[PDB]
Write an enzyme that holds these catalytic residues in place. Structure first.
Site, PDB file in Angstrom:
ATOM      1  N   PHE A  75       6.204  -4.681  -4.859  1.00 48.47           N
ATOM      2  CA  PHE A  75       6.295  -6.111  -4.626  1.00 48.47           C
ATOM      3  C   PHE A  75       7.659  -6.483  -4.046  1.00 48.47           C
ATOM      4  N   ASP A  76       8.736  -6.031  -4.692  1.00 50.86           N
ATOM      5  CA  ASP A  76      10.102  -6.047  -4.142  1.00 50.86           C
ATOM      6  C   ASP A  76      10.503  -4.588  -3.845  1.00 50.86           C
ATOM      7  N   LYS A  77      10.031  -4.085  -2.715  1.00 50.27           N
ATOM      8  CA  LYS A  77      10.271  -2.696  -2.328  1.00 50.27           C
ATOM      9  C   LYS A  77      11.752  -2.407  -2.129  1.00 50.27           C
ATOM     10  N   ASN A 122      -4.502  -2.032   0.630  1.00 46.14           N
ATOM     11  CA  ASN A 122      -3.286  -1.816   1.395  1.00 46.14           C
ATOM     12  C   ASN A 122      -3.144  -0.363   1.823  1.00 46.14           C
ATOM     13  N   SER A 123      -2.616  -0.181   3.031  1.00 45.18           N
ATOM     14  CA  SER A 123      -2.181   1.118   3.534  1.00 45.18           C
ATOM     15  C   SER A 123      -0.737   1.052   4.010  1.00 45.18           C
ATOM     16  N   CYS A 124       0.173   0.570   3.137  1.00 46.90           N
ATOM     17  CA  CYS A 124       1.523   0.223   3.581  1.00 46.90           C
ATOM     18  C   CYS A 124       2.300   1.451   4.042  1.00 46.90           C
ATOM     19  N   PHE A 126       4.879   3.282   2.131  1.00 41.36           N
ATOM     20  CA  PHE A 126       6.265   3.339   1.663  1.00 41.36           C
ATOM     21  C   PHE A 126       7.239   2.725   2.665  1.00 41.36           C
ATOM     22  N   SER A 193       0.703   7.161  -4.830  1.00 41.00           N
ATOM     23  CA  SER A 193       0.343   6.385  -3.646  1.00 41.00           C
ATOM     24  C   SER A 193      -0.785   7.078  -2.875  1.00 41.00           C
ATOM     25  N   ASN A 195      -1.326   6.427   0.262  1.00 45.25           N
ATOM     26  CA  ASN A 195      -1.028   6.174   1.677  1.00 45.25           C
ATOM     27  C   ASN A 195       0.056   7.088   2.238  1.00 45.25           C
ATOM     28  N   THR A 196       0.464   8.090   1.486  1.00 41.54           N
ATOM     29  CA  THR A 196       1.345   9.148   1.997  1.00 41.54           C
ATOM     30  C   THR A 196       0.581  10.457   1.898  1.00 41.54           C
ATOM     31  N   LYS A 247       3.845   7.658 -12.614  1.00 47.47           N
ATOM     32  CA  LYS A 247       2.772   6.755 -12.246  1.00 47.47           C
ATOM     33  C   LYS A 247       1.621   7.563 -11.683  1.00 47.47           C
ATOM     34  N   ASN A 276      -2.023   3.433 -10.532  1.00 51.31           N
ATOM     35  CA  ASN A 276      -1.908   3.006  -9.143  1.00 51.31           C
ATOM     36  C   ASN A 276      -3.274   2.526  -8.641  1.00 51.31           C
ATOM     37  N   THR A 277      -3.329   2.189  -7.356  1.00 52.70           N
ATOM     38  CA  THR A 277      -4.525   1.699  -6.716  1.00 52.70           C
ATOM     39  C   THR A 277      -5.594   2.789  -6.608  1.00 52.70           C
ATOM     40  N   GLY A 296      -6.341  -5.170  -7.943  1.00 53.83           N
ATOM     41  CA  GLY A 296      -6.934  -6.438  -8.342  1.00 53.83           C
ATOM     42  C   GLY A 296      -8.050  -6.304  -9.357  1.00 53.83           C
TER      43      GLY A 296
HETATM   44  C1  FMN Z   1       0.829  -4.140  -0.832  1.00 54.21           C
HETATM   45  C2  FMN Z   1       0.995  -3.232  -2.032  1.00 54.21           C
HETATM   46  C3  FMN Z   1       2.074  -2.349  -2.057  1.00 54.21           C
HETATM   47  C4  FMN Z   1       2.234  -1.485  -3.161  1.00 54.21           C
HETATM   48  N1  FMN Z   1       3.282  -0.602  -3.160  1.00 54.21           N
HETATM   49  C5  FMN Z   1       3.461   0.222  -4.268  1.00 54.21           C
HETATM   50  C6  FMN Z   1       4.540   1.070  -4.287  1.00 54.21           C
HETATM   51  O1  FMN Z   1       5.332   1.102  -3.353  1.00 54.21           O
HETATM   52  N2  FMN Z   1       4.721   1.911  -5.350  1.00 54.21           N
HETATM   53  C7  FMN Z   1       3.854   1.889  -6.407  1.00 54.21           C
HETATM   54  O2  FMN Z   1       4.056   2.663  -7.355  1.00 54.21           O
HETATM   55  N3  FMN Z   1       2.770   1.043  -6.411  1.00 54.21           N
HETATM   56  C8  FMN Z   1       2.592   0.186  -5.338  1.00 54.21           C
HETATM   57  N4  FMN Z   1       1.533  -0.680  -5.342  1.00 54.21           N
HETATM   58  C9  FMN Z   1       0.578  -0.707  -6.517  1.00 54.21           C
HETATM   59  C10 FMN Z   1       0.975  -1.767  -7.568  1.00 54.21           C
HETATM   60  O3  FMN Z   1       2.282  -1.433  -8.071  1.00 54.21           O
HETATM   61  C11 FMN Z   1      -0.056  -1.824  -8.685  1.00 54.21           C
HETATM   62  O4  FMN Z   1       0.018  -0.572  -9.342  1.00 54.21           O
HETATM   63  C12 FMN Z   1      -1.506  -2.047  -8.214  1.00 54.21           C
HETATM   64  O5  FMN Z   1      -1.513  -3.036  -7.201  1.00 54.21           O
HETATM   65  C13 FMN Z   1      -2.470  -2.387  -9.358  1.00 54.21           C
HETATM   66  O6  FMN Z   1      -2.080  -3.555 -10.056  1.00 54.21           O
HETATM   67  P1  FMN Z   1      -2.804  -4.992  -9.754  1.00 54.21           P
HETATM   68  O7  FMN Z   1      -4.272  -4.736  -9.912  1.00 54.21           O
HETATM   69  O8  FMN Z   1      -2.232  -5.861 -10.857  1.00 54.21           O
HETATM   70  O9  FMN Z   1      -2.449  -5.413  -8.352  1.00 54.21           O
HETATM   71  C14 FMN Z   1       1.362  -1.518  -4.228  1.00 54.21           C
HETATM   72  C15 FMN Z   1       0.313  -2.421  -4.218  1.00 54.21           C
HETATM   73  C16 FMN Z   1       0.124  -3.277  -3.111  1.00 54.21           C
HETATM   74  C17 FMN Z   1      -1.041  -4.239  -3.128  1.00 54.21           C
HETATM   75  C1  XCM Z   2       4.111  -5.516   0.191  1.00 56.33           C
HETATM   76  C2  XCM Z   2       3.136  -6.675   0.536  1.00 56.33           C
HETATM   77  C3  XCM Z   2       2.372  -7.491  -0.296  1.00 56.33           C
HETATM   78  C4  XCM Z   2       1.667  -8.386   0.550  1.00 56.33           C
HETATM   79  C5  XCM Z   2       0.660  -9.496   0.190  1.00 56.33           C
HETATM   80  C6  XCM Z   2      -0.524  -9.074  -0.692  1.00 56.33           C
HETATM   81  N1  XCM Z   2       1.437 -10.516  -0.530  1.00 56.33           N
HETATM   82  C7  XCM Z   2       0.950 -11.890  -0.604  1.00 56.33           C
HETATM   83  O1  XCM Z   2      -0.075 -12.199  -0.113  1.00 56.33           O
HETATM   84  C8  XCM Z   2       1.834 -12.848  -1.394  1.00 56.33           C
HETATM   85  N2  XCM Z   2       3.053 -12.523  -1.872  1.00 56.33           N
HETATM   86  C9  XCM Z   2       3.586 -13.566  -2.569  1.00 56.33           C
HETATM   87  C10 XCM Z   2       2.641 -14.563  -2.511  1.00 56.33           C
HETATM   88  C11 XCM Z   2       2.826 -15.923  -3.179  1.00 56.33           C
HETATM   89  C12 XCM Z   2       3.275 -17.144  -2.337  1.00 56.33           C
HETATM   90  C13 XCM Z   2       3.760 -16.877  -1.029  1.00 56.33           C
HETATM   91  C14 XCM Z   2       4.168 -17.951  -0.209  1.00 56.33           C
HETATM   92  C15 XCM Z   2       4.033 -19.227  -0.750  1.00 56.33           C
HETATM   93  C16 XCM Z   2       4.450 -20.484   0.031  1.00 56.33           C
HETATM   94  F1  XCM Z   2       5.519 -21.127  -0.542  1.00 56.33           F
HETATM   95  F2  XCM Z   2       4.756 -20.099   1.283  1.00 56.33           F
HETATM   96  F3  XCM Z   2       3.383 -21.309  -0.021  1.00 56.33           F
HETATM   97  N3  XCM Z   2       3.552 -19.443  -1.967  1.00 56.33           N
HETATM   98  C17 XCM Z   2       3.146 -18.469  -2.757  1.00 56.33           C
HETATM   99  C18 XCM Z   2       1.854 -15.828  -4.353  1.00 56.33           C
HETATM  100  C19 XCM Z   2       3.262 -16.409  -4.578  1.00 56.33           C
HETATM  101  C20 XCM Z   2       1.551 -14.147  -1.804  1.00 56.33           C
HETATM  102  C21 XCM Z   2       0.294 -14.991  -1.514  1.00 56.33           C
HETATM  103  N4  XCM Z   2       2.017  -8.129   1.816  1.00 56.33           N
HETATM  104  N5  XCM Z   2       2.907  -7.090   1.783  1.00 56.33           N
HETATM  105  O1  ORO Z   3       3.571   1.944  -0.025  1.00 54.32           O
HETATM  106  C1  ORO Z   3       2.324   2.050  -0.209  1.00 54.32           C
HETATM  107  O2  ORO Z   3       1.514   2.092   0.747  1.00 54.32           O
HETATM  108  C2  ORO Z   3       1.710   2.178  -1.595  1.00 54.32           C
HETATM  109  C3  ORO Z   3       2.302   2.937  -2.543  1.00 54.32           C
HETATM  110  C4  ORO Z   3       1.692   3.056  -3.773  1.00 54.32           C
HETATM  111  O3  ORO Z   3       2.175   3.731  -4.628  1.00 54.32           O
HETATM  112  N1  ORO Z   3       0.523   2.427  -4.018  1.00 54.32           N
HETATM  113  C5  ORO Z   3      -0.070   1.675  -3.061  1.00 54.32           C
HETATM  114  O4  ORO Z   3      -1.104   1.128  -3.303  1.00 54.32           O
HETATM  115  N2  ORO Z   3       0.540   1.562  -1.854  1.00 54.32           N
END
Ligand code: FMN
Ligand code: XCM
Ligand code: ORO
Length: 384
Positions: A75-77, A122-124, A126, A193, A195-196, A247, A276-277, A296
């Protein structure tokens, strides 16, 4: 959704839900995330003004979480938004996953939401600025923490992984330990992950054992070689050497899960993040074209069952950090009663937004009341 019943710096201020519904409908996912990080960078996110219930505190070894909700990795990479995310009401955040060198990640578009099912795919790959820059970001946080009493009990873990083209994962893991480990309250080893390419192979028992032992050895050497330094070694919340978590991915068979648990018992890992996912979800129509791991609501049952399984396979000896489809206080209690000590949110923050921590903390406290628990710790593993 007028917050007054429970102005703009209140996480439940009514405009946030309005802006979020609009964002979720019309605005690209990664752009929504950039906007979130931008608001946090300029410290204009709302913030939670409550003292948390002492009856919902929890711990993993010497880590004392002020409440049981943190923000999961990814979330905060880059560690650029730590204060502001924590001040929404979370007790901890796992930054990363980081790699030794920066990477821009896999090609876009690579993140897709489905509001109906409260799911993400997601297929981010890292995407991160690299261990050295993220270490500078975490040091800035640790310096602000040192001055702000309000942050002194909050926890920051660091998720570490490998660069795409690295051959031996251990080299990259050791690199991250030697640079960022002294600023971490715990290290999360990411072997899950999707995606690696080839990363999940490291969940094999023999590889995992060597990975855990190598990471522990490197942390132990960091201590040995720097205790006598004038500057105190552990510039973190705990003031101790970081704990080590692994993890794990939910896409494993029962034999793999049992062999991993045996390794976790032998190597004395401090915790396991479950999970993880998943790549095994099919029934999301809007994701049918798409690659990657699913997060989710559709991950909830899968990951809760996985917690039950690893709690029993490790004979309750390895603390559990729950990740997967946690949205409500009920969801959270199900993870805890399944074996989890603490919960991580990701999708809940995307779909519920600024109020995520306030709301789920309130829901969990009321449930602990209704269920007759004296505190949260009493509920850990009660399903069993
Ligand atoms: C966009 C995205 C990026 C993620 N990147 C990582 C990551 O860098 N490292 C990791 O351990 N998990 C990563 N995750 C997985 C989350 O940390 C979490 O384990 C997963 O989304 C399941 O929780 P949730 O169902 O509450 O979303 C990522 C998930 C998403 C959606
Ligand atoms: C690594 C990575 C993750 C993602 C995707 C899945 N993340 C998001 O969708 C996302 N993240 C943060 C938000 C919130 C937000 C955002 C903006 C605003 C406003 F003020 F602009 F309205 N309000 C609220 C929910 C709080 C959302 C919708 N992409 N990449
Ligand atoms: O950076 C990513 O693509 C990523 C890493 C991870 O550990 N889990 C995930 O869902 N995405």
């Amino acid at each position: 959704h007028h917050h007054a019943e429970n102005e703009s710096y209140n996480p439940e201020f009514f405009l946030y839900d309005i802006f979020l519904k609009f964002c979720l409908k019309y605005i690209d996912g990664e752009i929504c995330h950039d906007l979130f990080l931008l608001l946090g960078k300029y410290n204009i996110l709302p913030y939670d003004t409550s003292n948390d219930s002492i009856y919902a505190c929890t711990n993993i070894k010497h880590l004392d979480f002020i409440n049981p909700f943190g923000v999961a990795a990814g979330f905060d990479k880059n560690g650029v938004c730590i204060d502001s995310i924590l001040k929404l009401g979370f007790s901890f955040i796992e930054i990363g996953t980081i790699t030794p060198r920066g990477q821009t990640g896999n090609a876009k578009p690579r993140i897709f939401r489905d509001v109906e099912s409260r799911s993400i795919i997601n297929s981010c790959g890292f995407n991160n600025m690299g261990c050295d820059k993220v270490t500078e970001n975490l040091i800035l946080f640790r310096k602000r923490q040192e001055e702000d009493k309000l942050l002194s009990k909050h926890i920051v873990g660091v998720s570490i992984g490998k660069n795409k083209d690295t051959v031996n994962i251990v080299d990259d893991l050791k690199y991250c330990i030697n640079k960022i480990g002294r600023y971490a309250d715990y290290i999360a080893i990411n072997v899950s992950s999707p995606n690696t390419p080839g990363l999940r192979d490291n969940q094999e028992a023999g590889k995992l054992k060597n990975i855990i032992l190598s990471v522990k050895e490197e942390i132990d050497n960091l201590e040995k070689n720097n205790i006598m330094n004038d500057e105190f070694l552990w510039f973190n919340t705990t003031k101790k050497k970081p704990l080590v978590f692994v993890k794990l991915a939910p896409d494993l068979n029962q034999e793999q899960k049992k062999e991993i648990a045996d390794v976790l018992l032998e190597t004395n890992i401090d915790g396991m993040i479950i999970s993880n996912t998943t790549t095994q979800i099919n029934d999301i129509k809007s994701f049918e074209n798409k690659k990657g791991g699913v997060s989710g609501a559709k991950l909830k049952d899968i990951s809760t069952k996985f917690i039950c399984e690893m709690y029993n396979y490790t004979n309750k000896q390895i603390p559990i950090i729950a990740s997967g489809g946690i949205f409500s206080g009920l969801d959270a209690l199900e993870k805890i009663e399944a074996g989890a000590s603490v919960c991580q949110l990701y999708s809940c923050l995307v779909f519920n937004g600024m109020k995520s921590a306030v709301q789920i903390k309130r829901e969990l406290n009321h449930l602990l009341y209704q269920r007759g628990y004296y505190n949260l710790k009493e509920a850990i593993g009660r399903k069993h």
